[PDB]
Structure formats: C-alpha cells, structure tokens
Design a protein around this ligand. Sequence first.
Ligand SMILES: Cc1ccncc1NC(=O)Cc1cc(Cl)cc(N[C@H]2CCC[C@@H]2O)c1
Ligand SMILES: Cc1ccncc1NC(=O)Cc1cc(Cl)cc(N[C@H]2CCC[C@@H]2O)c1
Lengths: 304, 304
Amino acid sequence: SGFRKMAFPSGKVEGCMVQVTCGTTTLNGLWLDDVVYCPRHVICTSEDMLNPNYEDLLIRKSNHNFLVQAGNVQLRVIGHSMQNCVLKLKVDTANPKTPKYKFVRIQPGQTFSVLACYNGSPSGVYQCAMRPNFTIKGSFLNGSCGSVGFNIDYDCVSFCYMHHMELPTGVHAGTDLEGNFYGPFVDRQTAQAAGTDTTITVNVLAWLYAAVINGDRWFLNRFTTTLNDFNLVAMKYNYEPLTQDHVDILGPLSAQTGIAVLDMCASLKELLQNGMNGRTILGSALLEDEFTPFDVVRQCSGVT
Amino acid sequence: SGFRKMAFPSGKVEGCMVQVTCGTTTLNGLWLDDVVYCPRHVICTSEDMLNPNYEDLLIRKSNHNFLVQAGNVQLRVIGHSMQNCVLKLKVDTANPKTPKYKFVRIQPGQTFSVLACYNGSPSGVYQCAMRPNFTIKGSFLNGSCGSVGFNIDYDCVSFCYMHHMELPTGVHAGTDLEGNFYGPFVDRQTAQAAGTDTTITVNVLAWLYAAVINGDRWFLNRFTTTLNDFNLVAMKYNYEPLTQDHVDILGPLSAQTGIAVLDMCASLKELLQNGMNGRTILGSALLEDEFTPFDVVRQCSGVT
Ligand SMILES: Cc1ccncc1NC(=O)Cc1cc(Cl)cc(N[C@H]2CCC[C@@H]2O)c1
Ligand SMILES: Cc1ccncc1NC(=O)Cc1cc(Cl)cc(N[C@H]2CCC[C@@H]2O)c1
C-alpha cells in the first residue's frame, strides 16, 4: 500500500547524458549509438535568441565548434545536422551504454520521467505530464536544456521529450526527439502564452481508483451519472471531456475495485461541486491528474 | 523555475540490487563489495512471522539456503551473519558496480530517495521523509522488502534505509543498514501503532522559501512573530517546535530571498490559522513538509 508520484529508474538514461558546448553556450546532449542529440539553440548567443535564423547561424559552425564531453572524456565530432529544433552530432564512438530505445511523440495527458541535468551530469529525477496546453510543469534552471523525458517498458527506453525552454510564465516547453516542439512554441525569445491548462479527467479518475485500492474511500458516494451529465460538470471546472475511450482505458481499475466508471465519475462530480471540505485523498488536498490509468496499474502491481 | 518532489538519480543504486531467496521467501538485497544486505525475515515462513525467534530460525539455515541472484547470474554464498534485523550474506564476488558508499542513520525530518524493487529489479524511484513518528509514507507491495533509501553527495551514496514492513495502518517501517529499526517497530506480525505524525515545521518553511523563489508570493503578509509565539500556534496544529538551530538552518534561504525567518514564520502562522482559502502554493493545496532546507538549496541551485 501507499501511492507515490514515482519516476522510472534513471540509470539507463544517466548512461546517455553528455555535455555539449558551442562557443560560450553549454547544455546537455543525449548520446545514443554514434549520435548526440541536443537543442539547436546551443549555437546561439543571448543576442541571437531574440530573432534567430538557425540555418544562417549554423553555417558559421563546423564539427570542431561542437565540444562534446562524456564524463571527463572528449568525443570527436565527425558530422552535424539540424532536424527541426534539434541538432544531431555524429560522433566517432558509439555509446557503449546505449540502452534499447525508441523515439516516441506523446499525447497530452501522458506522463513521463525527467532526468534533470546540468553540464551533462544528472541532478535529479521526477515525474511529470504533457499538459493539455502542451507545456510541462518541471523544475529546470539555466543549463538544464537538453535534459530528456522518457518512459521505460522492461528494457526499452522510449524518449519522448527534450527540454528547450522556459516561458515567461514559469512553464516549460520542449520537443520530441525528432526536434518537433510540443504545442505551438518556438525556440525564440518572444511573447508566447501557453493556453488554458485544463485538468486531465481520465488521470483524476485513475488516481481516485488508486485511492480506493489504497484504502482512502471517504469520497465514494451513493450516486451515479452519465458521460453527458458528467461532462457538463467537467466543462464548468476546466476538466477535459471524458470519452468512451477513457472509460474503456479505466476498465482494469473498475474491475479491480468493483466500482463502475460512471459511479466513480459521480464521486468526482461531487468532489468538484462540494470541494474536499479540508479532507485529503492519498495525502493530497487537490485532485491529482499526473497519474495515467497505466501508471496506477503499474504502481499497484509492481511492474519492474 | 518550477519546484518538484525530486529524487536522486538511481543508477548507482540500481547497480547494487539483487534478489535474495530463502526457502519459499523472495525479497531484495543490496550488494556492496562482497556482502549482500537483506531483511532477516527472508528466513521466515508466514507462520513464523507471528512470533519469530530469529536466532533459532537462523540455526536451521546454511549458506547454500540463501539464493542470491544478480541479474540472471547466481552469486555463491560463503558466509552469513545476522546484525540486528538484517542479514549480511558474504559472497565470493565483489560487486563490480559498487559505488562509493556510507551507511548513515538519519534523523526524523530528513528526506531520502527510495528505489522500490521487486525480485531484485527496480520498479521506480520516489522521494520521501523519515516522519517524526519514525515511519515513512512510501509505496511498497509484497516483495518490496530490502528496497533501500539513500542520499547522494556527488559520487558517494549514503544508504539510510532498508524496507522491512508495512504496519496495519498502511505506513512503512524499516531499518538503517546496520539493521536497527527506525522507531520502536519490530519485525513481527503484531499490534504496532505508529505514534502522532507531526508536521516537519522547518521543512514547511523551506518549501515556503522555495515558493517565493519560484514566484508564488500571495501568502507573504505584513507581519512578524517570535519563536515562542510561533510555537504556541505550531503546538496547536501538531507541528514540530521550531528551534534556533532550525532558524540557522534556514539562513541561506532567508539570505537569498531577503525574507527574515520570523517573518516567514508569521506567514506560516496565518496559513495555519486561516487556511489556503482554495488557493495553492507550488501546485499544492496543503503545506508540504518533505523538502528539507538543503533539498531546496540543492534544487534551486542545480547541484549534480
Ligand atoms: C533559463 C531556463 C530555465 C529553465 N528551463 C530552461 C531555461 N533556458 C531557456 O529557456 C533557454 C532560452 C530559450 C530562449 Cl527562447 C531564450 C533564452 N534567452 C536567454 C538570454 C539571456 C537569459 C535568457 O534565459 C534562453
Ligand atoms: C506486504 C508488504 C507491503 C508493503 N511493504 C512491505 C510488505 N511486507 C511486509 O510487511 C513483510 C511482513 C512483515 C511482517 Cl512483520 C509480517 C508479514 N506477514 C505476512 C504473512 C502473510 C502475509 C503477510 O504480509 C509480512
């Protein structure tokens, strides 16, 4: 029992972290096979960030301008290319610690672990979610760019995020490993507001199922609802609309607890309308939405 | 910016996890040098857990009864001994992945990361604190015993916890790496109630400083207080008394923000007396107490 915001073990990703320096800028790179992936803004000076023409800036850079260090050893750069907002630095040595990996682009509402790094060295690991407005709420300081987000399925690391930016609002933006930003964000120092940060309803429900599994049952009521009735309340509270696909996804949790999905929806509807009344659920005073139904099943079953 | 419940990178500890089986019982062990450390209840059957005489049970066990597997390879056990509530299994091979390490016994209020494991394999990593009643609020299922808690200082892993038990109340109990339980807990299936779980005041204050650093400033007020006045309110709310040692420990955070410690105490006093009024601080609707002042400095400065 117990339910925690749990991150994946980070060892397989720690073995891929390198430091990339170009001119006066230093950030993190991800070394997989003989390629180092990093944010393309490594080639920019602070003055360049206002209105960068990355293709034009990159012309002035050669392979020897990209300093890649793995631990205390320098890697030799034998090629460089830009793919969307990431640079791919071909090095002469394959990473001996390359795990089995995939590059995946996640959907809003999906969770992943972040290994926050500085100068190619890991500082910590935490769990976060791709928000419905395509931002993430991480913990990143200057130098953290190039830190990656990932999920693990047994021995295969699926990299889904690379950190690029902090918006003026303190929220984070980045790309998948093909260099495409999540959301409408651009790697430029310009006015970029995030969009409405709605609550991931299906994740809230999964977390209520985790609460019942772990003994917190005070919020269970004598009511039921329908998807259309529940969604009228969800709209009012800036919650994402719940679909039959979401109900299907919650099926294993509903089976394990014997609580029908629409009954749990009625419990969530009352929590939205009435509040917690100073009570907590799994040590939280707000409804948690950064656990997917798969995260709950995984944590409650002990998948390694 | 951003502030997350961050765990240490787990790679150095993943390299130490092994599976230990004795008879029908399987749990986790920690392999450091040529010794594997595990909970002594690995020698018990479920019937033995009611009233175990560990010295008597251990007599019936020989080195060949302890099956230690690291990955898919079996380790040869050449000695066994019991130290308090842990067994030390001497193996014929030093762990090649042994990091620089120390065994430390932590004080209540201190935080650490847990690498939850099953069958010697890591499932996840999360951050937790030794509660003032010497329990931890983790996420552990059957088979998680022997999972360890640790802190890292650059390249040295300080192991502080080994998981042994879940109490009937869903809280967790365990030992340091010398086998001494934290708190009054015993490795027996008997009535054991935890004690009052008070709030770690100094950690709450550190987290309020992290909030101000990260822009959440709504709770700052025009007041101040004294240690004695603050503690009258802290007692009423089951908060640990704040001492001058704690004020000294918060010194760097007070210097960084320009907010005197007693002024922050007055803000916390108003939050206790008035509540949050439906507002949040760093994405939380309750006062968070599992970040030490050192955790806040570390996360806000990017220590790797
Ligand atoms: C600072 C940070 C914090 C967290 N995560 C990430 C970061 N870093 C960034 O966003 C990188 C970045 C991206 C853009 Cl579009 C512009 C800049 N401009 C810089 C010129 C002087 C300082 C200012 O940061 C930098
Ligand atoms: C189960 C668990 C969950 C989380 N963390 C840890 C655990 N495991 C434990 O506490 C181990 C343990 C310690 C004591 Cl003192 C007694 C037992 N008795 C068992 C006999 C039948 C089943 C029951 O669990 C087992």
